[PDB]
Amino acid sequence: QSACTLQSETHPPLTWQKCSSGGTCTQQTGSVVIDANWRWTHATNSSTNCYDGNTWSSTLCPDNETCAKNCCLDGAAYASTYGVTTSGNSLSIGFVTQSAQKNVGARLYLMASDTTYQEFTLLGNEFSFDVDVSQLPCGLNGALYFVSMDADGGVSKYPTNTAGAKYGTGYCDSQCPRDLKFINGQANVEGWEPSSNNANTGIGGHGSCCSEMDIWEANSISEALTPHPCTTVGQEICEGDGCGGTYSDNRYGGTCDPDGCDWNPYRLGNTSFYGPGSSFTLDTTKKLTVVTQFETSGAINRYYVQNGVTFQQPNAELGSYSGNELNDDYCTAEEAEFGGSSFSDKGGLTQFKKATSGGMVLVMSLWDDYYANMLWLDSTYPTNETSSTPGAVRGSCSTSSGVPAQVESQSPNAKVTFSNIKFGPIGSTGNPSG
Ligand SMILES: *[C@@H]1O[C@H](CO)[C@@H](O)[C@H](O)[C@H]1NC(C)=O
Ligand SMILES: SCc1ccccc1I
Ligand SMILES: [Ca+2]
Numbered sequence: 146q147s148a149c150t151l152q153s154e155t156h157p158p159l160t161w162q163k164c165s166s167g168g169t170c171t172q173q174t175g176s177v178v179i180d181a182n183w184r185w186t187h188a189t190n191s192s193t194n195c196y197d198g199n200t201w202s203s204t205l206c207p208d209n210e211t212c213a214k215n216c217c218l219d220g221a222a223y224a225s226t227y228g229v230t231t232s233g234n235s236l237s238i239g240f241v242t243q244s245a246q247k248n249v250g251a252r253l254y255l256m257a258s259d260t261t262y263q264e265f266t267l268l269g270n271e272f273s274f275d276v277d278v279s280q281l282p283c284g285l286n287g288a289l290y291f292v293s294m295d296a297d298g299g300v301s302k303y304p305t306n307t308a309g310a311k312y313g314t315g316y317c318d319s320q321c322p323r324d325l326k327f328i329n330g331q332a333n334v335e336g337w338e339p340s341s342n343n344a345n346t347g348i349g350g351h352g353s354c355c356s357e358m359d360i361w362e363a364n365s366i367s368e369a370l371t372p373h374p375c376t377t378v379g380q381e382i383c384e385g386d387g388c389g390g391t392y393s394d395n396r397y398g399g400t401c402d403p404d405g406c407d408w409n410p411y412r413l414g415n416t417s418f419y420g421p422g423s424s425f426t427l428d429t430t431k432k433l434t435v436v437t438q439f440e441t442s443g444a445i446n447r448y449y450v451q452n453g454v455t456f457q458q459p460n461a462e463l464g465s466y467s468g469n470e471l472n473d474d475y476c477t478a479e480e481a482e483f484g485g486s487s488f489s490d491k492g493g494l495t496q497f498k499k500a501t502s503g504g505m506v507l508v509m510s511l512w513d514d515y516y517a518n519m520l521w522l523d524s525t526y527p528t529n530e531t532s533s534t535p536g537a538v539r540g541s542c543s544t545s546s547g548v549p550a551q552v553e554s555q556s557p558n559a560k561v562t563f564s565n566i567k568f569g570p571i572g573s574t575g576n577p578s579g
Contacts, residue, residue, distance in 0.1 A: 146181070146327045147189060147217040148308040154220035156256055156311075157231040162578050164569025171579040175263055177236065177509070179227060180252040180313040182326055184218045196326060199339035199347045212332035213305050218312045227251050228560070235564035238511040240285065241557035249553060252316070254294075255507040260311045261296050264504030265568060271438040272360060273574040277562040279421075279430045281364035283540075284519045284547030286512050287561030291358040291505035292318050293379045303330030317355035317380040319373035319401040321388040323348045329382050336385070342549070343515050352388035354401045355380045356500035360437050365421050365429040367523040367540035369412075370437065370447060370471065371405035374488070374496040378503065391516055402491035406476035408447075409522070412539045413461040420541075426459075427451050438571050439501055443494040444472035483536035511561050518547030 148154075156176035164170035186195045188205055195205045195216035206212030223229045228239025229251050242248045257263040265272070274289060281287050298315035299306050306327070308314050314327060326333055328351050336350020356378050359371040377400055383389075389399020396403060410418045418426045427433055427449055434450040447458040447469075458469040466478035473494055480486055513519065520526040523540030524547070530537035552559075567574040 146186070146213055146306060146308050146312075146314070146330070146332070148312050149187065149189065149217035149219045151187075151192065152185070152220035152222065154311060155223075156259060157223050157229060159231045159236055159255065160234045161255070161566040161568065162574075164567055164573040164576055166570045166573060168573070168576050169579065170567060170569065170574070170576055176256045176259070177229070177231065177253040178256055178310065178313045179221050179223070179229065180254070180316055181218050181308070182324070183227065183248070183251060184221060184312065186216055186218055186326060188215055189217050195332075199343065199345055201332070201334045201337060206332055206334045209331040209333065209335050210305075212334050213327065213330060216332065218308045218314075218327075229253065234566065235562060236509060237560055237562045238287070238509065240511060240559035241553050243557075249513065250511045252508060252510040252512075254310070254313060255509075256310065257296070260309060262294060262298065262310050262506045264296055265291065265507060266504055267291065267358065267439045267501040268498065269439065269441050269571065270569060271436060271571050271574055273434060273436045273565075273567040274563055275432055275434050275565040276361070277432045278363055278365045280559050281561055282552070282556055282559065283364065283366055283523055283542035284513055284552045285364045285556075285559055286362055286510075286514070286519055286522060287364065287563075288359065288508070288510045288512070289361040289563055290508050291360065292316070292508055293355040293357075293500050293503065294506040295380060296504070299329065299380065305330035315380065317353035319354070319357040319375060319405070320390040320403050321352040321354035321383045321399050321401055322390070323350075323352040323388060323392055325349070325353055328353045340515065346515070348392045350385055352383040352390065353380060354383050354388070354399065356401075356497065356505070358501065358505065359405065361435060362522060364519070364523060366542055367409055367411050368419055369407050369409040369522060370445070371407040372445065372471070372494065372497045373402050373405040374491040374493065374500070375401035376491060376496070378499050397487050397490070402487045404485060404487045406471065406479060406488045406493070408458070408471050408475070409539055410459055410461075411541075412536055413463065415459045415461070416541075418459050426456055434565075436574060440571065442472070443498040444470050446470055509563055513549045513552055514547060515549050518549070520544060520547060
């Protein structure tokens with residue numbers, strides 16, 4: 146896709162800190178950009194939409210190539226249309242924003258410059274951020290994660306994509322998403338199936354895969370940490386059911402692991418650690434710091450800070466595993482006790498190390514789930530399961546919670562605030578900010 150300028154594009158600024166082993170941190174200035182899927186897509190020479198509702202213009206977009214030649218992405222009014230605002234080192238994403246249209250959520254990337262994404266090499270480093278999940282009820286997910294996207298949004302590889310990172314192009318993840326309108330410089334109009342439950346989305350014939358590190362998928366009820374390997378580390382297009390993931394016939398048939406080796410404290414047995422109120426170790430009605438360390442062995446460590454008190458990830462006992470570190474033994478025990486072989490089949494933490502050793506882009510989002518109502522995160526899933534089934538219970542939300550239309554109308558003012566992002570060598574982010 147190309148870019149149009151009927152509406153200007155001004156990325157909201159966001160500062161973050163880069164720390165060093167020597168004990169000092171320094172302020173960095175970046176900005177955020179909204180994903181292409183949320184943008185107005187119209188003809189290069191007029192205001193005629195190439196996509197409206199959940200259908201493509203058959204005249205402007207008869208096929209993927211023609212569509213990309215005829216159509217451009219335009220600028221975004223961040224606050225008024227998308228409910229995205231920034232203030233210093235703070236970023237807020239509103240749930241439902243009503244302007245001339247209704248907008249639900251947003252997926253944003255941290256930029257290095259106006260035309261390129263900031264890449265972070267995670268291995269041997271740690272990432273820290275503060276978060277306020279108090280306004281996120283059952284059914285919502287304020288996520289902060291990393292994906293192996295190209296810095297230019299794919300421009301150097303796909304010439305027909307001239308919009309680039311500036312317009313939020315090039316997204317990919319371990320779900321190998323097929324809801325993307327533009328992938329590899331072409332539209333995704335071929336094979337498009339409008340969603341039966343979502344008036345604004347659909348599934349195309351192609352998807353975009355890559356490694357994904359979900360540092361934080363959470364609401365005020367539950368939270369999960371989840372690495373997802375892929376046999377091809379970086380962004381790669383997939384076709385139809387060969388994509389795997391949620392909207393394909395064989396979920397485990399693709400190149401990526403859509404499940405991951407997840408760590409949810411509640412799912413592992415500690416139902417008193419994270420939740421709303423004083424009866425929980427970490428009280429989700431108040432702000433908290435989340436620190437994630439990527440050691441060179443490939444293992445992942447985690448500690449939290451609230452009101453100056455530090456809490457290491459709580460201990461879990463799962464089969465032959467005992468500890469609080471997300472490592473090979475944990476991932477193997479998880480598969481043995483809860484089932485599955487996807488994570489291991491994709492290479493486990495060894496293959497995932499190839500992703501963290503390379504550059505990854507920071508993504509911050511707020512979404513509701515039209516497929517499984519976020520039950521996999523904060524409720525019993527599948528819903529026919531009991532608490533007696535290992536790993537079935539992931540949170541205290543009702544299995545009737547999370548219906549998108551219901552939460553959109555009941556909690557439109559829900560929001561997540563991510564702030565004070567710090568990144569540096571292990572043991573460095575707790576030092577004084579610059
Ligand atoms: C949950 O984790 C916290 C923090 O480690 C700990 O103090 C508490 O004893 C744990 N509770 C259970 C039931 O394991
Ligand atoms: S990653 C959560 C999950 C796991 C297995 C099947 C479907 C779903 I959504
Ligand atoms: Ca270790």
